[PDB]
Amino acid sequence: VDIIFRSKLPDIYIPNHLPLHSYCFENISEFSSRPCLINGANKQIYTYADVELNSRKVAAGLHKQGIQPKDTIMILLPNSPEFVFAFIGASYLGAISTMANPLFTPAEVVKQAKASSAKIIVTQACHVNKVKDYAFENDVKIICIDSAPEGCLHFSVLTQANEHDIPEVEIQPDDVVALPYSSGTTGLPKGVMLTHKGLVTSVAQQVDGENPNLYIHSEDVMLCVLPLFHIYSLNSVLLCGLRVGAAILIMQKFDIVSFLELIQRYKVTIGPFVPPIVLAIAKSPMVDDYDLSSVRTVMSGAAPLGKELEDTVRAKFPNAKLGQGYGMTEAGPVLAMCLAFAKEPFEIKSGACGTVVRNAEMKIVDPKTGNSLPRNQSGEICIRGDQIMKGYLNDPEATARTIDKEGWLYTGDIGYIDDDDELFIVDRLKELIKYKGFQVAPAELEALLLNHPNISDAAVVPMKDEQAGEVPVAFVVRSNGSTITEDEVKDFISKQVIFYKRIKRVFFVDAIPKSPSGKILRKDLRAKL
Ligand SMILES: Nc1ncnc2c1ncn2[C@@H]1O[C@H](COP(=O)(O)OC(=O)/C=C/C2=CCC(=O)C=C2)[C@@H](O)[C@H]1O
Ligand SMILES: [Mg+2]
């Protein structure tokens, strides 16, 4: 029998039959006039009424541009009001947003555009070159938020549409609304189908209930420095923020001065961070010149945090409850959330990544035997609930290997749950590398390396790094007679991938250690490194 773990919070009613926009704006009448989005770039403020109206206008505009229910748009933008309007606009149409890092290489953007069948790409003028040829050859519309080059439209073509022209639509709970990409537990990035039902469930698990797990209210100011094109910010900052009527303070890029100035100036109360930001707060001499006493909740997620950096937060944010959230794109994303963040807070331990969310089930499974494990025993973390993905787009085989027929998602993460129902992640079974919280799929890099005429075999694994958490490193077997150097391997990769996917070290070996099936012995390589 499976040994099942649950939240210390009771299950709540979740209205996950509601479309995502209907749910997130369910209580909008209570805070219609309140600030919703604050753009750090220009200090422009949109109210809740503004954001709902602009999203509806954009929905009508997208319809006019040919977006029908179940069609997909690609958002290729930094954090911005336009990102939000495009995302919520598509939701109103029963359509799908796929989201991508605007700093991706042309090849990376186009691969995702093709895989997702995006009909429109929403971007900035400076990135049109990345997609223009592909878009022309495939009649993909390009919409620019700043200025429109030839063969492109301006975003005003969407915002100038009449909100009353949103077509009648019957959106279903299992309809897809968001399509972030993730490599999951092995292989290449895949389209994660996140549904209305799924995202409503995930948001509710965090912010709804008499005692919400993550207590945020309509007088809070939440920093949005994490990228909205990744699921952590998209769900836990934007969607959760909207649901409770919080103000969301958007930053386009991290820089330490702007970060500190915005916190102090706007009296930021919620700080959703990742470990590199925590480390920057730890190290920067200028931090002591700022008043950070407004911050009442600091969360770290996306990568392990550690003890030294937890001490940093305590010292630098004297009024804050500090803790972690643990998510995975396929999981909706939140698996566990620090109960110190609750309206009636629970005691927590350092190094814990939270307690499994309410309205969900967790088990810990031994990879060797397949047996479910009791408390205080490490194994693979698995989760079950309405919040998880529908599956991978056009990839039932990968879906079947990732979520079983009893509804269990296998995370590829190793951890244990203690007597206080606190979850600790201790290792990663899956091949995924995390650079500053960003996914680096070694299979992608390995495919590139094997394409080189002078490389016989290759394996990409994480190496521990202070600044980035992990960096990708390559073990490379040179072809016979090859003299390819570390720098030459690095340059070959660097010309083809976004910065964070870059190989930081190459180790040249005679053979890549492999299992008798033909699979890389990655744990052995990590032990060596
Ligand atoms: N807290 C964590 N500690 C150790 N590791 C963590 C943690 N959170 C995520 N990870 C790692 O990233 C993987 C998931 O990567 P992915 O990019 O798909 O998703 C994410 O990283 C999402 C994280 C997140 C979302 C919402 C939120 O509120 C708090 C955190 C996990 O399987 C695990 O290996
Ligand atoms: Mg319906």
- The CATH number that applies at residue 446 is 3.30.300.30
Look at the alpha carbons of 216, 218, 224, 228 in this order and tell me if their dihedral is positive or negative.
positive
| Residues 360 and 475 placed together within one structural domain of the fold | no
The domain containing residue 485 runs over which residues?
430-529
Number of domains in the chain: 2
DSSP category for residue 443: H
**Within the chain, how many helices (H) and strands (E) appear?**
16, 27
Q: Pairing between strand 455-465 and 469-478?
A: antiparallel
Determine the distance separating the centroid of ligand 2 and the alpha carbon of 173, expressed in angstroms. 6
Is 440 in the same domain as 495? yes
Task: Write the residue with the smallest CA distance to atom 15 of ligand 1.
Answer: 328
Burial 430-452 (b: 16+ CB within 10 A, else e): bbbbbbbbbbbbbbbbbebbeeb
Same structural domain, 403 and 486: no
Answer yes or no: do 304 and 345 share one domain: yes
At 198 the three-state DSSP class reads helix
Number of alpha carbons in the 13 Å side-chain half-sphere of residue 527: 5
**At residue 283, what are phi and psi to the nearest 5 degrees?**
-95, -35
Separation of CA 127 and ligand 1 centre (Å): 28
Q: How many CB atoms lie within 10 A of CB 162?
A: 11
**Contact present, 378 and 416 (Cβ < 8 Å):** yes
Q: d(Cα 75, Cα 228) in Å, to the nearest integer? A: 10
Which residue, 428, 434, 508, is CA-closest to 474?
508
Tell me which long-range contacts 133-141 makes (C-beta under 8 A, separation of at least 24). Answer: 134/110, 140/113, 141/65, 141/66
CA distance 244 to 24: 8
Residue 243's nearest CA partner among 271, 185, 203 is 203
Distance of CA 52 to the CA centre of its chain: 23
* Deposited experimental method: X-ray
What's the CATH code of the domain at 346?
3.40.50.12780
Annotated binding residues for (E)-caffeoyl-AMP, written as ranges, equal: 232, 236, 302, 325, 329, 337, 413, 428, 430, 434
Q: Which residues contact 466 (CB under 8 A, 6 or more apart)?
A: 279
What separation in angstroms does the CA of 101 have from each of 109, 472, 501? Answer: 8, 19, 13
CA atoms of 9 and 341, how far apart (whole Å): 12
Could you tell me which residues are beta bridge partners of residue 222? 248, 270
Burial class (CB in 10 A: 0-12, 13-18, 19+), 47: middle
Distance 171 CA to ligand 2 centre (A): 4
By the 8 A CB rule, do 337 and 423 touch? no
Residue at a domain's end among 369, 401, 429: 429
**Which 3 state secondary structure label does DSSP give 348?**
coil
Bridge partners (DSSP) listed for residue 164: none
CA–CA separation, 216 vs 206, rounded Å? 9
For residues 409 and 461, state if they share a domain: no
Q: Which residues are annotated as a binding site?
A: 182-186, 190, 232, 236, 253, 302, 324-325, 329, 337, 413, 428, 430, 434, 436-437, 439, 519
Q: Distance between CA 350 and CA 424 in Å, rounded?
A: 10
Instruction: Answer with the one of 429, 458, 487 that is the final residue of a domain.
Output: 429
227: preceding bond cis by omega (within 30 degrees): no
Whether residues 108 and 177 share a domain: the answer is yes
Residues 279 and 316 in one domain: yes
Ligand showing the shortest atom-to-Cα distance for residue 94: 2
Looking at 328-431, which runs of residues are DSSP E strands? 334-337, 355-356, 361-365, 379-384, 391-392, 409-417, 423-428
Question: Which amino acid is it at 416?
Answer: Y
Q: Does one domain contain both 272 and 365?
A: yes
Is 405 in the same domain as 483? no
Give the residue carrying structure tokens 């190094």.
Answer: 351
Residues 347 and 406 in one domain: yes
Q: At what angle do helices 128-138 and 106-116 cross, to 10 degrees?
A: 40
Listed resolution, Å: 1.6
Which structure tokens are listed for 124?
């900035």
Look at residues 429, 451, 466 and tell me which one is the last residue of a structural domain.
429
Q: Give the residue, by CA position, lying nearest to ligand 1 atom 9.
A: 302
Residues with beta carbon inside 6 Å of ligand 1?
Answer: 182, 231-232, 235-236, 301-304, 324-329, 333-334, 353, 411, 413, 425, 428, 434, 439
Alpha-carbon distances of 412 from 185, 398, 433, rounded to whole Å: 6, 14, 12
The CA 138 to ligand 1 mean position distance, Å, reads 35
Assess whether 451 and 424 both reside in one domain: no
The candidate with the shortest Cα–Cα distance to 201, out of 11, 15, 389, is 15
User: Pocket of ligand 1, candidates 194, 207, 236, 326: which has the most ligand atoms within 8 Å of its Cβ, to mutate?
Assistant: 326
Asked whether residue 319 falls in the same domain as residue 391, the answer is yes
